[PDB]
Structures are given as C-alpha cells and as structure tokens.
Amino acid sequence: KAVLAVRREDVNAWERRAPLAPKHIKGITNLGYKVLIQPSNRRAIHDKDYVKAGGILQEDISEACLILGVKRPPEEKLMSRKTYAFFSDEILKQEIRLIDYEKMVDHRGVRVVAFGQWAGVAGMINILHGMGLRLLALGHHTPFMHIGMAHNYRNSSQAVQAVRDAGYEISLGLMPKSIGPLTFVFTGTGNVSKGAQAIFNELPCEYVEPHELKEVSQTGDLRKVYGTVLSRHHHLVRKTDAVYDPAEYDKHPERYISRFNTDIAPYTTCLINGIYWEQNTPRLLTRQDAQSLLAPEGCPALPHKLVAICDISADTGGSIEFMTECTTIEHPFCMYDADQHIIHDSVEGSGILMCSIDNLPAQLPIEATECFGDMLYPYVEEMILSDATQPLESQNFSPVVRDAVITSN
Amino acid sequence: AVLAVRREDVNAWERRAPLAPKHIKGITNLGYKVLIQPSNRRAIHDKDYVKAGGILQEDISEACLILGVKRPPEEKLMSRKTYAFFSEIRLIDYEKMVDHRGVRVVAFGQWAGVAGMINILHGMGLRLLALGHHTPFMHIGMAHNYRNSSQAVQAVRDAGYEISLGLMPKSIGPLTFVFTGTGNVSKGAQAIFNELPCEYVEPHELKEVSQTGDLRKVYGTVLSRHHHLVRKTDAVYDPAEYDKHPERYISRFNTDIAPYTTCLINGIYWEQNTPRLLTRQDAQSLLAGCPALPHKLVAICDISADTGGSIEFMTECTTIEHPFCMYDADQHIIHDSVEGSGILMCSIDNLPAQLPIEATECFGDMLYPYVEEMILSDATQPLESQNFSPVVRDAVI
C-alpha cells in the first residue's frame, strides 16, 4: 500500500548513478511494494532494466511517501508531507523529513552506506592517465599514454584490460631509461585504498617495505613498477623520544610528528592519499616540504622524483597542506609550481601534478550504483514505512536511520 | 655517404618520425650508415631503430642528409648539408613532392581520418551527456588514449555492441553520418564507422531514415559532387564544366542534406571560387527527463586540416589538448567546450600525430623509394647537375 519512488537526477550532467540497481527493485517488488521509476536518459543503467525488474516507468511520483535520490534537489522541487533521502530550518517550515546517507553509522560510529572501493578504482585510472600526459609534457612518451580517464571505459573490466595492456608494454622494456624506477605509495586503511591497489596489481608490480623505497627508487628493474603500503607505525613518532604508541596517538595526536617528508617523500614518484585527516593530526607534507622537494638532451632525468599526488578520500586540504583546491571530472589535473601557485586544468611547466575529485564514483556509475544499493537495501523497508505526518519518536526506526534524520523531526 | 634521423624538438605532441625501423633495415642493407639521434619523445623506442642496424648517437655532424618531420629552429640548421621536413643550406619540402599528374607522393594516407573519426565519436559522447543523454559513445576516448588503431577498433566494436543491444535513449532519434571528399583521409573515417552497427544509404534516403531509422543502428551516406552541386541558371550538373568554371555552381547541401544530418565528417579540399557547403545564414536557420535534440545537427569534424573553407563559420582550428569548440546561437565560438547551445566543431591540424606509430610506418613507406637520391645529394654543387627525379628536384625550396 506504501509506494517507493527513485527520482531523476537534475543537479549536474555527470550524475549518472542512482541509489538502487534493478536487482534491488526486484527484491522490493517481491515484498509486494509498488516502485515508481522517474524516466531518465541521464542514468548509466537504462530505464528498460528497472522495468524488467518490476518497476513502473512514470513521470508523476505524487503517490510516493519515500523518494530516494543521490543529490538533494534545489528545494523548489520538494513535494510536502513526504520523506526524501540524499547524499547531502528552511524546508523544516513544512512536514518534510530529510535523511542523509552519509550520517548512517553503526554503534561504533563507522559508515554503513557508501560507494566502497569505487573512488579508489577511478582515482588510480585517472592518475595513471595524468602521469601519461605529465611525462609527455616533460618530453617522455610512455605506455601511460594508452590509459584514458575512468569515464572513457564501459566498466572496471574494460579499464583493467587497458591497464594490463599498458603493463605488457612496460614489461617488454618500452619505458625510457633516463627517468628511472617508478615508485607508488598508498596511505589510509579503508575500502577506497584497496580499490587503487586492485588497479595497480594489474601492472607488472612489486610491493616493498617502506624502508626499501630508498634502495629501489635508485636500482629498481625498469620493466616493473614498485608499490608500498604506508601504516601509522611507519612514519608517526613522539616529539619527545621519537617512539610510536598506537593507543596514545588515537587519544593525543598533538604529541606526534610525521617523518614522511624525510623518510619516504624523496623516494616517491606518485602519492595515492587515502587518509581521513583530523584537526589535530600531523600533516604528511607542508608548504616548506614542497619548496625543498622542488628546489632540485632527448633523454633527460626528471626535474625531481615526485611527479604526482592523487587524493582518493574526502580530505581535500588536509594531509597535504598545499593541496587546497579540488579538481573536477571535466578538468581533472592542476599544477603546484615552484612559485607556490596552483595552475588549473594543466600538466605543463614546473612542479607537482595534483588530482582531487569529490565525485570519483560517478566515473564508474553502474558498479557504484550496485555497491551503494547493496549497502542501502537492508534499511529500505524501514524508510518506506516512514510517516512525515507523525512525530519522529513513534517511528519504528533503527538507530542507523533515526540518527541520519537532519530535520527537526 | 651518411644519413641521420634528427630528434623532434618543435612541440610535445610530435611523437612521429620520417622513417620506421623496417626502413632503416632496408637502407643499411644497401650498405649506407644511418645515425639515429636519441629521443624519449618518439612513440617507437630507440632500441627498435638499433635492432634494425641504426647507430644511436647525439653528434650528427658527419651526416650530409638530415631527415626530420618539422623544420628545426633556424639557429639549429648546420651549413653545407641537405635537410628534408614538412614546412648554402639545401632544404626539401615533402609537401611539394608530386608526380607527373601533380598528386602528392609523400603523405600520412588514411591516418588523419582514422584519428578524426575516433575524436568526434568521443566528442558526441560528451556533447550528448551535456544535453542530458548517457550514450555508449561515453565509452570511446581520444585517439591518443589507445596504443594503436587495433585497440581503438576494439573500443568502437564494444560501444557498437551496446548500441546493437538497444542502450541508446529513444528520444534522441536516429543518428546520421555524412562523409564528403575523395581522398585516403575520408576512407580512414569510413573504416572506423564500419566497425559500428552501420547501414549505408543514398543521399536522397537520408530524409526518410533520419525520422524512421532503427535505433539499434547508425546510418551513413557518401556525398559526391553530382549529389548536391547544380548550375545557378538551369540547376544541372556537368562535371567537366564544374572543374573549369566552379563559379557557375551553387550547393543544395543546406536544404537537401544538412537538415537530416547528425554528424558531418568533412574531407573536401576547398578552393577560392568553389561553392560552400554551409554559410553563416544556413547556421542561423539550422539553430532556430527524455527530451528530443534541440536541432538535428550535433557535430562537424574537419579531417582535411582547415582545407575545407566549405563551412564558413568554422574559422578557428582546435588542438589535440583542446579538441572541441561550440558555435552557439549568437554566432560566438566558445573554445575547449561542449556546453550551451549550437554546433560542436573539431578541426585539428596534426591528427596523424595521435596515431604516431602507424603514421610513421605509412609516411616512411611513401618516402622510402626517394631516400637514396637524397643521400647522394651534394649541397656544395649546383642543383642542375644533381641526379634527382622531377619529384625531388621540384620539392627543393
């Protein structure tokens, strides 16, 4: 008797995802609920697949009490006496219940509704493409020229075949010698970091311990790429006695510094940053660290070892002090040059190539939709039996859903 | 006695060379010594030129013939030597090398068309998304994102399968592609289109299929002079007369074909007194959750390098880095963009450089037969006594 609707995305041309996939609509209709799908040429999964799974294609979504979307409408489009959920008072004036997927957390306070590894997958394809263009601008044709942007591929499978194909060229010795071994450092603990690792694993890779990076950055095999996973214990020490205690760094991070600038950064070609930075944590790199890193025929050496930094988390303006500006899917790369200036939509001149896109998952919209839908599915029935007309206190919500309401009730 | 291939220094995108490894194997088997200047820029690695009998060496002083792609900086030209490029020092221009009929003999063949067709299919992906339509054209990148034409063809076939499975949005209607010109360059664009689920029709049919075509296919037509050119007086076509006096003719392309066209691939070589395909006034008239297109014509790709003054309003060239611009409803050109109102346009001058290995092989094949003449050139003696063919003699500038 209660009716669910999936709204069309209207916010931005790049929003090709949805909060639920066909298989989720097949599940919800098998529980006897009616599900309206608002027609959309924008969605990367076609309307006829939502219809095949028992959804009814219809512009008018007035009858629905739960409306699921990805991004909040401009507020002009919000029907009254209904519950909306998005990835986000004025509207509180009315009887409108708003839910924020980002605030849906377990008893420990860890998120339970997200895009999983998919930001890392897209970020790693993006930065490999970026390094192709950056190294050509410095005068080096490489096999990284043969990897496009994440959104130029049908799905992660087609992307993986292009990464393996460029990997074969590297493994056959088609890199230029003069630029030396290539080193990749991965930071952070989450699913997003595993995604970037999963793309790297398709190249002719070799994982080393952080202390080895000094050696392999000089004498590594030029038919391979080198990776290292960086953990807290590798680079964080107390200001007093240069010791690491994990229980103490959790409570009082202010007693700690990072040795990343002296121990790892000078031996790094590409930093993939997956850290979630906090207001009292040590930084990986400062503005002064950048000055020192930059200060240094047809076959030149690199101007300096560090070519690129890709941010795959939220943390835009955190661990790397000078990475202040976000990039976009359309303009993915900017340069931090030797005069401490950001040059937008460019891979030319001096300095460090940087990539910081806020909606990386949208570049792989089908797999992003499947993954998100899987995490949301168990909570959908609670949300369908939500009543915007009644008080919050009387709703049969789990703490997960209750705590994620961002309206007065 | 000694031949040299110089490193390209002009532009970061110049990844081609005048000869491929197999050509160096041929020249060394004639007993000539060949120096190759080392280059991380070249898309074919130094080790392959060495494997074929070339010697890798920075100092190129002992060579009497120096082959390159683009003409060096004037400060870099050594005295008493012969240089060949694409424009007491003897200079040869590959572009001026023509046979007794006056047709070019040293060029990049079909490869501009191949790159141009991949570029515009990518362009249409971005343009149609900006108008609110996810399509399988989103899954084709720029020509330079692929290792060679084979990897590009697999991505075009893959997107073709999505179209053939019915994954186009219906509201956008049938997609029509018109090919103009007679050259190799036009065959290249056709060769990429043939890898989609295509169907070729006669020009008169375009009116019908632009309204009732199967949305699981893409439609193509090849446009000849006889289809659209008529005399001002009696609306008749005589091919012998259009050759001599093109000023007596107009084009019916604006009224007969343009209104039923999604994508114009333009390969015409325009002359100062030929009729235009489209004028500024034609453009004004053409521009006038599941929407129709604002108008039928989405995109124009020039594959002859702004050698088609055929489109009056296509004034400014695009680049590999910034491939697309928009001609909007107010007659304004917006650079490096697929957003807002109007027509998407692509006009890149060095399309072959996006497929640098195949471009090098093709060019090298056309040049190979004339290399021996050029090696036995002497810059110190007069031109009249050189044992040159008319092809090479006429190309000295």
Swiss-Prot record, chain A:
The N-terminal and the C-terminal domains contain respectively the lysine ketoglutarate reductase and saccharopine dehydrogenase activity. The keyword Nucleus does not apply. The keyword Acetylation applies. One of its GO terms (biological process) is lysine biosynthetic process via aminoadipic acid. Its main location: mitochondrion. Induction: Induced by starvation. This is Alpha-aminoadipic semialdehyde synthase, mitochondrial. The modification N6-acetyllysine is found at residues 26, 34, 71, 93, 103, 251. In the N-terminal section; belongs to the AlaDH/PNT family. One of its GO terms (cellular component) is cytoplasm. It is found in: Mitochondrion. Homotetramer. One of its GO terms (molecular function) is saccharopine dehydrogenase (NADP+, L-lysine-forming) activity. Residues 6-409 are annotated as: Lysine-ketoglutarate reductase. The chain holds residues 23 to 452 of 926 of the full protein.
